[PDB]
Amino acid sequence: PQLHNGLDFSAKVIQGSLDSLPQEVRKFVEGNAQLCQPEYIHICDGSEEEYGRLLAHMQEEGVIRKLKKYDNCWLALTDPRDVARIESKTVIITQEQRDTVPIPKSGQSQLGRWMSEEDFEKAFNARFPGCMKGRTMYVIPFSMGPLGSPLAKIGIELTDSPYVVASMRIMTRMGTSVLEALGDGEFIKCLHSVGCPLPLKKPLVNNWACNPELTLIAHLPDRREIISFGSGYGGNSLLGKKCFALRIASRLAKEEGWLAEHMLILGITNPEGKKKYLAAAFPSACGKTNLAMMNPTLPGWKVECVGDDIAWMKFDAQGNLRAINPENGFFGVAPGTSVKTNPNAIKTIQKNTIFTNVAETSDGGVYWEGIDEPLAPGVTITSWKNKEWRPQDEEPCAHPNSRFCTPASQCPIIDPAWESPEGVPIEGIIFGGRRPAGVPLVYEALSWQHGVFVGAAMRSEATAAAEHKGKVIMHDPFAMRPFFGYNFGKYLAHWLSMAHRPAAKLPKIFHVNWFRKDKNGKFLWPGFGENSRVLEWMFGRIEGEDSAKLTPIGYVPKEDALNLKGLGDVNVEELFGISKEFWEKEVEEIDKYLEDQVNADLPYEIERELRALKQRISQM
């Protein structure tokens, strides 16, 4: 009801009808419309016609440019201050800090950023009132996971950015059919604004609306709400991806008995006609998408991609660990992608793809560092900074975190079960990161508990996907450090508890290192498609082949167990060397980290594995 005409926003709806929305969805839209004061409300239907009009609008506004060389591909250039996920402005709100992070012994927590409800209310009120003035509020109904899948969850994202709408159409399942499936069910509430109400007080760089000073990405798991302000970019604005499908979801998974993880899912078929699925957790910028889409060098082997970034997993009644990819597309790092490093991505991205912050060629194409493809005479390059660019300039032509956004169904090796609602059965889990020294090419964990310790102990040299820079070795347990939705100690206990489940078929756990360097700073391992030789060894180990040798850190391939035919120049002694001096220091760093950062919430089984590793190294 109303005493005037200030609460009913029906007169501002330019697509759809508030009356057709489920009651709780309507309240969420209208209540936030009252707060944010949009000029128009657009309820997305997911149709091709809608997508075409939004592209045309963004093109008319100068937000995107058409890449005339390809089929329906587009380029967006951002403000250089809004180029990546920002870990330091990402917070989780719970009544008690211990629900979100373990209370550290001495230092500041690196495992999350907690904010009190009272502090968030002040931050919220300083940002959102009136923030969409003069803009359209888009209502995005989306499903994470195939519609109707038992592990599928529905969200509603409100946003004032058409770029977010177009990207969410690719990255999620979006539109009218989701609203019909939702009915009066529960949904995750996602609220986003670029934070630039009109009239603009500050001019825009590259026609990219953002508010870097006020950027804040908040999660309220108890209210099932995600609230993001000030950034239009990737993990900050596509709220289904990191905010929902890892942070909120990992908390729900803890409550409901499943897992939500930063893992690719791949299926690999051997020359005997046997197929197995594996999941792999590597940190951002550490090669998940390259592995998920790999073109194997070994003849008679095939790799198919289920997903490249997020996995939701649950034991079924039979004890199989089943996984789904909740995403609908790939949001992949562009630089370094070439016919030699990821040819299956090259095939995927040549139609229906949105590129952000890569270079444009004068004939309507895309360019980036590492594309490894020469240009014809006379073709010139415009950098992501909208400037003429020559290879003689110092700066790269594409931002290091520039991305492609592409439909998963276009991938030529997309797995036939990638949308199956029952998920695929996982028989191995791979961990790994960038370790230039000390850590061998591959090893296998000694037990479930040791494998959980291996995940907990993950470290990786700093890349350029967050705001971290330089060559520092940082901790990134389970590749989830930016993404834990709750107390990491309780997350470890959750993982350990899977061994207590009746008839659970626990997968084998492996750790890889593609990145070991020699004294010259040269990679010892060619990687990319050649990583199929490591997968072959894992496949045989899952089948029970006697192809491993025991070391203090776990099982490693026997001499001649790895197919190295075609790379006779491979230094196997350096690739698999285990130095007592390196590992004595490694265990001390892991010990100091777990003691400070996990403290009273460290499960005893993890401390026991640490003690056992220390003892095995001491006996070397």
Ligand SMILES: Nc1nc2c(ncn2[C@@H]2O[C@H](COP(=O)(O)OP(=O)(O)OP(=O)(O)O)[C@@H](O)[C@H]2O)c(=O)[nH]1
């Ligand atoms: N040496 C070596 N480098 C690799 C290999 N696979 C991938 N890379 C490197 O990994 C980098 C690209 O990784 P990203 O696409 O950023 O990694 P990602 O895990 O998919 O990142 P997110 O999408 O942010 O989660 C490039 O620097 C590649 O050179 C490999 O097998 N060997």
Ligand SMILES: O=C(O)C(=O)CS(=O)(=O)O
């Ligand atoms: O940082 C990551 O792991 C990504 O996959 C990119 S974003 O979705 O977080 O922007």
Ligand SMILES: [Mn+2]
């Ligand atoms: Mn205009």
Ligand SMILES: [Mn+2]
């Ligand atoms: Mn990726």
Ligand SMILES: [Mn+2]
């Ligand atoms: Mn990722």
